[PDB]
Amino acid sequence: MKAKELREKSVEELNTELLNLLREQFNLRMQAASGQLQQSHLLKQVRRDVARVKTLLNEKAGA
Amino acid sequence: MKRTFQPSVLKRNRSHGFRARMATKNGRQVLARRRAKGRARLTVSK
Amino acid sequence: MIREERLLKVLRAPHVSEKASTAMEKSNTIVLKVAKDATKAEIKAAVQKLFEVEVEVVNTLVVKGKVKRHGQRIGRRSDWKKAYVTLKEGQNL
Amino acid sequence: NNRPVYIPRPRPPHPRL
RNA sequence: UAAGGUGAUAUGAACCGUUAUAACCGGCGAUUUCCGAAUGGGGAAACCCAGUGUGUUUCGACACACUAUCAUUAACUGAAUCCAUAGGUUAAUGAGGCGAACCGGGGGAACUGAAACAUCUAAGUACCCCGAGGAAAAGAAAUCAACCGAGAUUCCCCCAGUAGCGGCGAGCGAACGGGGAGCAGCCCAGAGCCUGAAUCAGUGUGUGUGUUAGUGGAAGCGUCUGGAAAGGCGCGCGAUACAGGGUGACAGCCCCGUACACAAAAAUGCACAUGCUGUGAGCUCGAUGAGUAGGGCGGGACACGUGGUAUCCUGUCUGAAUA
RNA sequence: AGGACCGAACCGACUAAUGUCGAAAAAUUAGCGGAUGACUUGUGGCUGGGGGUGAAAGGCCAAUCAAACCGGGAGAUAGCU
RNA sequence: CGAAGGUGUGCUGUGAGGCAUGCUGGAGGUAUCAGAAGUGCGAAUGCUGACAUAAGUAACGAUAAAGCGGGUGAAAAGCCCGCUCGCCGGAAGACCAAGGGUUCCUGUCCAACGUUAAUCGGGGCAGGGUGAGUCGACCCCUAAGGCGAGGCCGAAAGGCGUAGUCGAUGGGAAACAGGUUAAUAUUCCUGUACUUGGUGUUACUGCGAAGGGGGGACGGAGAAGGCUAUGUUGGCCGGGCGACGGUUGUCCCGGUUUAAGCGUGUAGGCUGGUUUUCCAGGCAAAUCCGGAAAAUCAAGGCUGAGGCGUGAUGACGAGGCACUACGGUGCUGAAGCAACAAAUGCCCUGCUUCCAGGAAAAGCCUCUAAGCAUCAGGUAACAUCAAAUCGUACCCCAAACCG
């Protein structure tokens, strides 16, 4: 999942970034803190996805 | 008898702090020597 | 804008302790860990946006790390900030 | 949760634990 | 490249992918918090406080960019007096610091030797400052030589412990010349003819070559001891590879490797061809370096320490000729 | 009013004893002088080594001072052990 | 089917050493002849690491002083509960400032420390704990002092210094009572408030400074008056009459506390006010300060502790009642008054004298300059918003700081 969002305009990729930041990050971290989280690779993969989305945003917007 | 050393953070920082060292040209040379030697603590700081 | 992302970034995780439970059951306050800066206004906005609740006032404090010696090697834990968000008469969690 | 810390093998005169 | 990995102390939990976007390396890019030349101001280092202009859920409050000094250039303002200048405001380019040694310059000693010690030696060494480079400096004689002759500077070997300097004491100690490394010559002080005329600097294409990831790469078994055999014995094969590391005791044929043959999407250092921009061939004449040379006063370097002291420079006072 | 008097805190150590491999690399007990000033003290700075300061003893300058400490000349030199 | 090192033996040479071997050892050593040594240690008050020695000796760190019953524990004089004895109590108590940085509380153990044991600790490991518009830092200004755009000087480095910028040891705005955890509280909970700015409404109005004026803004010594914190007695409230004589009595025990803010503003101290006219003064101007004239009253104005009522028929409150993981938690709660004495603390930066003549700036009130005055801005009342960030444990005459 690296080129799927490379053809998505600024607004929709920004919406996807907002969704990834709001869900699958706060819920996962609070579940981990409270001990309710069983799978930890979710945090790593979602963080990597957020980083990739930010990189795509930087590449597209501006230059 | 009161011993020679009376601790004071303000005095220590203003006498041997990094900014005090950089204020004078020679202190920059002292910092360069410390960096070349490789000591972890270049100067005294909190 | 990135105000919303700052709100969704300031909060880190909740805190659990006997004092936390006592404050929640008596004072209607929840203590949670926050970012290093985590200013009061940003924390208030973030909690209002996330928990869809109402908070009377928020106060925070900085908890200094501990010096622990693993084997012969000493080390200081990373300092973290905790905030007691006080809810009004209407609380959910 | 991370209960296990992987305590290292200590010195001959170590805390009896 | 790829079927093993999510770095190690340091196991564990949960996952990714196995024919390709699992993992790893390389080239090009994005983020790159704060201090640190820090450069918006300050400051006790990782800290505080801000102004301006661009856009915004409750006026609330937020995000982005700029906001230091000097030097040069350009523009607008601008007094003591008209002018003008000084000064002030704004636009553009360069530096500000960190680096082991080498280079040049401005400074710059002592210990110690002379068996003391003041001349001297130590020494232009110890050490400080400034400036830049990958080398730097110097460099085409107002030089030598001797009236025989050599024609840029630099480095190595003789001359060389020679001649010389030196309370001629300590000690210092060349030069002409000879043999080697490498060899390039120009430009301004100025006019006329011809004027891309050769060589160079700045950018693209192509060929060649090397790096940043790598690939292919030969051949041994049975028996005895022995925990384990690579070790005793037997008979075999490769070798453009017994150079090396590991493999339960010492391995050419167990693996990684070595000899040898190959590999590059992208960026690369260097040798050429082909392009575009820039200074700029060759011929005739003139000119050919003034507060300088030199000299008085005091010193420094030339082996030469003021001695008969030649040579160059400098602090002050003077000061020509120019072919 | 007293650079006044006796006398607490505070300043100093004039006498005696213990302590000299002590609790302290000048200490403790009782006496002792001042205790409104020429007093003392907390904080913040300045005076830096042939130099600073010194109601001046050749005193002090971080337990080291008739010339501190740190790195270099430097493995100074020693007709000496 | 056993190298070197280590560990004994028998030989061998005038000798440094060589040879073979019993045991550990486990994979390295090396003939003869030549080549080079950081090549042979027994002393240099030679250096590094270990161990004797004095020696199971001094000593076990102010001569304030421990014991007993019960509890855990294997071990009890030192750990925990209770009763006695003693010490400090101007401290050997409680707060802080500087200085340390989790030593603070709980669970858990005696590996190392406590000059002994220790189940214990400021020890080892795990967890919890630091809540600020009113506390301080932060921020405005600044003294001593530092940096220092321009500038002066100096071979360079660099030294001085202006405008400016830092620099609290100082000046600026605001909170008190009670309660709570094992650790925070003037931060949390209950009540009363207080202060600075932004936003909007209402009625007015001239606003507007790095400029001017006041204040900020100050020494020493000393006496009195009113006060207060605080303590004594008495009255009142609840209880007691008591193991060795008496103790219903003029007797004994414990309580008898309540803040900040709000209004009145007193004791005391300071000062003469109201109005008009003018002035080259205050580096420009000014209705502000200062000076000169007058008419009027003689009082006004400023500062000012404390007490009094609201704060508060609220909290607190001796004691009793019910359960206890037997440490402790819930309910309740009577009176809460007068006099005296009284401080180094307030009136008081007050008042009287003395020479040694006793900081600066900012916030604050006022005046106008430039510019605008249908605006903007300010005033007075109302509602609302914000007051960010940092330390908040613990020790602080000590076991935790410097020695």
mmCIF file of C-alpha atoms (C1' of nucleotides) in Angstrom, chain G residues 73-278:
data_model
loop_
_atom_site.group_PDB
_atom_site.id
_atom_site.type_symbol
_atom_site.label_atom_id
_atom_site.label_comp_id
_atom_site.label_asym_id
_atom_site.label_seq_id
_atom_site.Cartn_x
_atom_site.Cartn_y
_atom_site.Cartn_z
ATOM 1 C "C1'" G G 73 10.084 -13.381 63.118
ATOM 2 C "C1'" A G 74 14.312 -19.175 63.051
ATOM 3 C "C1'" A G 75 17.010 -15.995 65.627
ATOM 4 C "C1'" A G 76 14.170 -9.571 70.016
ATOM 5 C "C1'" A G 77 17.782 -4.908 74.058
ATOM 6 C "C1'" G G 78 17.978 -2.158 69.611
ATOM 7 C "C1'" C G 79 11.860 -4.070 64.271
ATOM 8 C "C1'" C G 80 6.116 -2.671 65.846
ATOM 9 C "C1'" C G 81 1.852 -1.536 70.146
ATOM 10 C "C1'" G G 82 1.346 -0.223 75.466
ATOM 11 C "C1'" C G 83 3.349 1.554 80.810
ATOM 12 C "C1'" U G 84 7.073 3.510 83.256
ATOM 13 C "C1'" C G 85 12.471 6.577 83.753
ATOM 14 C "C1'" G G 86 15.334 10.479 81.465
ATOM 15 C "C1'" C G 87 16.899 14.825 77.690
ATOM 16 C "C1'" C G 88 15.827 19.333 74.483
ATOM 17 C "C1'" G G 89 12.112 22.646 74.700
ATOM 18 C "C1'" G G 90 14.977 30.789 72.145
ATOM 19 C "C1'" A G 91 15.448 23.693 70.558
ATOM 20 C "C1'" A G 92 17.920 18.510 70.426
ATOM 21 C "C1'" G G 93 10.409 22.130 68.295
ATOM 22 C "C1'" A G 94 7.647 24.045 63.421
ATOM 23 C "C1'" C G 95 8.375 26.770 59.091
ATOM 24 C "C1'" C G 96 11.356 28.243 55.243
ATOM 25 C "C1'" A G 97 16.010 30.733 51.919
ATOM 26 C "C1'" A G 98 20.594 28.630 49.642
ATOM 27 C "C1'" G G 99 22.197 23.675 48.747
ATOM 28 C "C1'" G G 100 21.005 18.270 47.424
ATOM 29 C "C1'" G G 101 17.381 15.526 43.485
ATOM 30 C "C1'" U G 102 12.932 11.006 44.833
ATOM 31 C "C1'" U G 103 16.699 9.976 50.094
ATOM 32 C "C1'" C G 104 9.009 11.004 50.541
ATOM 33 C "C1'" C G 105 4.735 6.754 51.269
ATOM 34 C "C1'" U G 106 3.464 1.626 50.443
ATOM 35 C "C1'" G G 107 4.644 -3.602 49.104
ATOM 36 C "C1'" U G 108 8.721 -6.642 49.248
ATOM 37 C "C1'" C G 109 14.504 -9.221 51.052
ATOM 38 C "C1'" C G 110 18.586 -9.379 53.912
ATOM 39 C "C1'" A G 111 23.024 -10.230 48.266
ATOM 40 C "C1'" A G 112 26.634 -5.308 50.112
ATOM 41 C "C1'" C G 113 26.466 -0.707 53.994
ATOM 42 C "C1'" G G 114 24.711 0.778 59.644
ATOM 43 C "C1'" U G 115 31.905 0.683 63.195
ATOM 44 C "C1'" U G 116 27.679 -5.734 66.484
ATOM 45 C "C1'" A G 117 22.713 -8.796 65.206
ATOM 46 C "C1'" A G 118 18.614 -6.667 62.914
ATOM 47 C "C1'" U G 119 12.842 -9.187 60.727
ATOM 48 C "C1'" C G 120 14.751 -2.766 60.774
ATOM 49 C "C1'" G G 121 16.748 2.112 57.579
ATOM 50 C "C1'" G G 122 18.139 7.921 54.475
ATOM 51 C "C1'" G G 123 20.105 -0.203 51.786
ATOM 52 C "C1'" G G 124 18.459 -3.834 47.088
ATOM 53 C "C1'" C G 125 13.809 -4.333 43.595
ATOM 54 C "C1'" A G 126 8.486 -2.949 42.277
ATOM 55 C "C1'" G G 127 4.471 0.490 42.577
ATOM 56 C "C1'" G G 128 2.353 5.416 44.136
ATOM 57 C "C1'" G G 129 3.140 10.428 45.105
ATOM 58 C "C1'" U G 130 4.606 17.081 43.294
ATOM 59 C "C1'" G G 131 -2.656 19.809 40.847
ATOM 60 C "C1'" A G 132 -1.359 27.782 41.545
ATOM 61 C "C1'" G G 133 -4.740 34.273 38.030
ATOM 62 C "C1'" U G 134 -4.104 35.088 44.346
ATOM 63 C "C1'" C G 135 2.590 30.767 46.945
ATOM 64 C "C1'" G G 136 7.609 31.941 44.472
ATOM 65 C "C1'" A G 137 9.795 31.803 39.887
ATOM 66 C "C1'" C G 138 8.135 34.074 34.984
ATOM 67 C "C1'" C G 139 7.351 39.376 33.315
ATOM 68 C "C1'" C G 140 8.091 45.734 33.866
ATOM 69 C "C1'" C G 141 12.257 49.003 35.933
ATOM 70 C "C1'" U G 142 16.914 49.420 37.972
ATOM 71 C "C1'" A G 143 21.549 50.126 41.769
ATOM 72 C "C1'" A G 144 26.897 47.735 42.145
ATOM 73 C "C1'" G G 145 28.616 45.268 37.927
ATOM 74 C "C1'" G G 146 28.783 42.896 32.939
ATOM 75 C "C1'" C G 147 27.930 43.109 27.211
ATOM 76 C "C1'" G G 148 28.049 46.819 23.841
ATOM 77 C "C1'" A G 149 25.590 49.096 17.344
ATOM 78 C "C1'" G G 150 28.356 53.669 16.053
ATOM 79 C "C1'" G G 151 33.203 55.839 18.123
ATOM 80 C "C1'" C G 152 38.435 56.396 20.525
ATOM 81 C "C1'" C G 153 42.999 53.785 21.237
ATOM 82 C "C1'" G G 154 46.266 49.715 20.421
ATOM 83 C "C1'" A G 155 51.261 45.595 15.761
ATOM 84 C "C1'" A G 156 47.093 41.603 15.943
ATOM 85 C "C1'" A G 157 44.750 39.464 20.136
ATOM 86 C "C1'" G G 158 42.506 43.194 22.324
ATOM 87 C "C1'" G G 159 41.278 47.732 26.207
ATOM 88 C "C1'" C G 160 37.618 51.842 27.085
ATOM 89 C "C1'" G G 161 32.928 53.606 26.265
ATOM 90 C "C1'" U G 162 27.643 56.260 23.992
ATOM 91 C "C1'" A G 163 22.827 55.150 22.416
ATOM 92 C "C1'" G G 164 20.898 50.633 23.947
ATOM 93 C "C1'" U G 165 20.786 45.393 26.491
ATOM 94 C "C1'" C G 166 21.436 42.328 30.602
ATOM 95 C "C1'" G G 167 21.958 42.204 35.770
ATOM 96 C "C1'" A G 168 17.550 40.943 42.588
ATOM 97 C "C1'" U G 169 20.432 41.038 47.046
ATOM 98 C "C1'" G G 170 15.492 45.972 45.738
ATOM 99 C "C1'" G G 171 10.495 48.863 43.853
ATOM 100 C "C1'" G G 172 4.913 46.650 40.782
ATOM 101 C "C1'" A G 173 -1.875 43.349 41.117
ATOM 102 C "C1'" A G 174 -4.743 40.028 43.824
ATOM 103 C "C1'" A G 175 -6.940 34.378 49.302
ATOM 104 C "C1'" C G 176 -8.393 33.385 53.957
ATOM 105 C "C1'" A G 177 -11.031 29.513 57.449
ATOM 106 C "C1'" G G 178 -12.084 24.337 57.907
ATOM 107 C "C1'" G G 179 -11.742 19.088 55.819
ATOM 108 C "C1'" U G 180 -9.282 15.353 53.179
ATOM 109 C "C1'" U G 181 -4.794 10.882 51.220
ATOM 110 C "C1'" A G 182 -0.024 6.478 53.172
ATOM 111 C "C1'" A G 183 2.539 10.984 50.532
ATOM 112 C "C1'" U G 184 -0.043 17.688 47.509
ATOM 113 C "C1'" A G 185 -2.130 21.654 49.459
ATOM 114 C "C1'" U G 186 -2.927 29.381 50.794
ATOM 115 C "C1'" U G 187 -2.682 24.291 44.433
ATOM 116 C "C1'" C G 188 -7.803 19.442 45.808
ATOM 117 C "C1'" C G 189 -13.178 19.826 48.214
ATOM 118 C "C1'" U G 190 -16.981 23.432 50.950
ATOM 119 C "C1'" G G 191 -17.769 29.559 51.531
ATOM 120 C "C1'" U G 192 -16.884 33.992 51.104
ATOM 121 C "C1'" A G 193 -14.076 37.146 47.790
ATOM 122 C "C1'" C G 194 -10.077 39.947 45.427
ATOM 123 C "C1'" U G 195 -6.731 41.887 41.124
ATOM 124 C "C1'" U G 196 -5.023 42.850 35.771
ATOM 125 C "C1'" G G 197 -6.275 43.172 30.640
ATOM 126 C "C1'" G G 198 -9.567 41.701 25.774
ATOM 127 C "C1'" U G 199 -14.704 41.509 23.827
ATOM 128 C "C1'" G G 200 -20.027 43.614 23.518
ATOM 129 C "C1'" U G 201 -24.082 47.023 25.541
ATOM 130 C "C1'" U G 202 -25.521 51.678 28.020
ATOM 131 C "C1'" A G 203 -24.723 57.787 29.141
ATOM 132 C "C1'" C G 204 -21.210 61.184 28.646
ATOM 133 C "C1'" U G 205 -16.774 63.331 27.247
ATOM 134 C "C1'" G G 206 -11.752 65.619 24.212
ATOM 135 C "C1'" C G 207 -8.261 62.268 23.532
ATOM 136 C "C1'" G G 208 -2.902 61.746 22.664
ATOM 137 C "C1'" A G 209 4.112 60.707 24.811
ATOM 138 C "C1'" A G 210 10.890 57.992 24.917
ATOM 139 C "C1'" G G 211 8.344 65.298 27.400
ATOM 140 C "C1'" G G 212 7.150 68.099 32.208
ATOM 141 C "C1'" G G 213 5.308 67.922 37.571
ATOM 142 C "C1'" G G 214 3.934 64.774 42.342
ATOM 143 C "C1'" G G 215 4.779 60.279 44.402
ATOM 144 C "C1'" G G 216 7.422 56.043 44.318
ATOM 145 C "C1'" A G 217 11.804 57.862 47.648
ATOM 146 C "C1'" C G 218 14.558 55.945 52.159
ATOM 147 C "C1'" G G 219 20.208 57.572 57.905
ATOM 148 C "C1'" G G 220 21.403 56.964 63.165
ATOM 149 C "C1'" A G 221 19.748 57.107 68.276
ATOM 150 C "C1'" G G 222 15.743 57.619 71.721
ATOM 151 C "C1'" A G 223 10.691 58.392 74.849
ATOM 152 C "C1'" A G 224 5.559 58.190 75.320
ATOM 153 C "C1'" G G 225 0.113 56.828 73.954
ATOM 154 C "C1'" G G 226 -3.302 53.538 71.672
ATOM 155 C "C1'" C G 227 -3.260 48.613 70.001
ATOM 156 C "C1'" U G 228 -2.788 43.431 68.735
ATOM 157 C "C1'" A G 229 -0.567 38.263 68.709
ATOM 158 C "C1'" U G 230 -0.221 35.972 73.147
ATOM 159 C "C1'" G G 231 -0.982 34.309 78.448
ATOM 160 C "C1'" U G 232 -3.495 34.642 83.782
ATOM 161 C "C1'" U G 233 -7.967 34.835 86.527
ATOM 162 C "C1'" G G 234 -13.169 34.783 86.814
ATOM 163 C "C1'" G G 235 -18.294 33.316 84.816
ATOM 164 C "C1'" C G 236 -20.419 29.396 81.618
ATOM 165 C "C1'" C G 237 -20.494 24.358 79.608
ATOM 166 C "C1'" G G 238 -19.547 18.366 80.204
ATOM 167 C "C1'" G G 239 -17.468 15.150 83.638
ATOM 168 C "C1'" G G 240 -15.457 13.695 88.485
ATOM 169 C "C1'" C G 241 -15.642 12.748 93.968
ATOM 170 C "C1'" G G 242 -11.690 9.272 93.306
ATOM 171 C "C1'" A G 243 -7.582 2.142 95.018
ATOM 172 C "C1'" C G 244 -2.829 5.699 101.639
ATOM 173 C "C1'" G G 245 -5.979 10.513 105.966
ATOM 174 C "C1'" G G 246 -10.274 14.671 104.126
ATOM 175 C "C1'" U G 247 -12.247 16.356 99.433
ATOM 176 C "C1'" U G 248 -21.026 18.385 96.882
ATOM 177 C "C1'" G G 249 -16.780 22.286 97.763
ATOM 178 C "C1'" U G 250 -13.769 29.237 98.241
ATOM 179 C "C1'" C G 251 -12.806 21.772 95.057
ATOM 180 C "C1'" C G 252 -10.337 19.286 90.461
ATOM 181 C "C1'" C G 253 -10.033 17.991 85.140
ATOM 182 C "C1'" G G 254 -10.888 19.564 79.323
ATOM 183 C "C1'" G G 255 -13.287 23.486 76.206
ATOM 184 C "C1'" U G 256 -14.530 28.450 76.264
ATOM 185 C "C1'" U G 257 -11.571 29.425 68.498
ATOM 186 C "C1'" U G 258 -13.310 31.615 64.360
ATOM 187 C "C1'" A G 259 -9.721 34.304 59.219
ATOM 188 C "C1'" A G 260 -9.454 37.516 54.286
ATOM 189 C "C1'" G G 261 -13.084 40.746 52.042
ATOM 190 C "C1'" C G 262 -17.121 44.356 53.120
ATOM 191 C "C1'" G G 263 -19.244 49.332 55.691
ATOM 192 C "C1'" U G 264 -18.304 52.882 60.060
ATOM 193 C "C1'" G G 265 -14.244 54.968 59.930
ATOM 194 C "C1'" U G 266 -11.981 56.218 65.787
ATOM 195 C "C1'" A G 267 -6.817 56.722 68.817
ATOM 196 C "C1'" G G 268 -2.760 59.076 66.534
ATOM 197 C "C1'" G G 269 0.132 61.847 62.735
ATOM 198 C "C1'" C G 270 0.545 65.419 58.462
ATOM 199 C "C1'" U G 271 -1.211 69.947 56.429
ATOM 200 C "C1'" G G 272 -4.490 75.942 56.448
ATOM 201 C "C1'" G G 273 -8.087 75.749 52.852
ATOM 202 C "C1'" U G 274 -11.861 78.277 48.613
ATOM 203 C "C1'" U G 275 -11.898 81.857 44.238
ATOM 204 C "C1'" U G 276 -9.810 85.183 40.676
ATOM 205 C "C1'" U G 277 -5.580 87.752 37.859
ATOM 206 C "C1'" C G 278 -0.628 87.658 36.133
#
